[PDB]
Write a protein that binds this ligand. Structure first.
Ligand code: A1BSY
Ligand code: ZN
Length: 139
């Protein structure tokens, strides 16, 4: 679990979105595993606007933050799950690191701010859904 709070927006994994997220829907993209809903309270997270390939992520299954090198956002094949059939997920970045399904939503940050959230994993790899291209989150 986990979300990014920026301005009047809440960013979450689309597969973990609540009834409230869907009733206050702004945008969602199944191919990116993202959903953005509106909030009544103002968010203070800073979104990074960069091409950083190093950062730190929070791993709830270990109660620890880990430093990682990660790939550039791209289309990566993702195994079928209870939420999606087998498919390419876009805007995904992989790193060598620990993750379990409940780790989705953990923030990945660089010196510039929030880069994305945990979205996939398996076999000692962790995947992050990028949010740096969503320029509208700031306005
Ligand atoms: C952090 O996720 C994991 C980590 C480890 C393992 C293990 N065994 C499995 C996962 N789950 C995972 O990758 N999923 C399930 C939820 C939807 C995700 C998606 N974006 O399509 C794909
Ligand atoms: Zn950066």
């Amino acid at each position: 679990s986990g979300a990014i709070y920026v301005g009047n927006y809440r960013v979450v994994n689309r597969h973990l979105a609540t009834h409230n997220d869907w009733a206050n829907l702004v945008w969602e993209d199944s191919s990116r595993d993202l959903l953005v809903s509106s909030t009544t309270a103002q968010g203070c997270d800073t979104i990074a606007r960069c091409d950083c390939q190093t950062g730190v992520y929070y791993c709830s299954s270990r109660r620890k933050h880990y430093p990682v090198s990660f790939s550039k956002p791209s289309l990566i094949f993702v195994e079928a799950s209870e939420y999606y059939p087998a498919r390419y997920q876009s805007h995904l970045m992989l790193a060598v690191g620990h993750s379990e399904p409940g780790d989705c939503g953990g923030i990945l940050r660089c010196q510039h701010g929030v880069v994305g959230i945990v979205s996939t994993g398996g076999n000692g790899l962790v995947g992050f859904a990028d949010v740096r291209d969503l320029l509208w989150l700031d306005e």
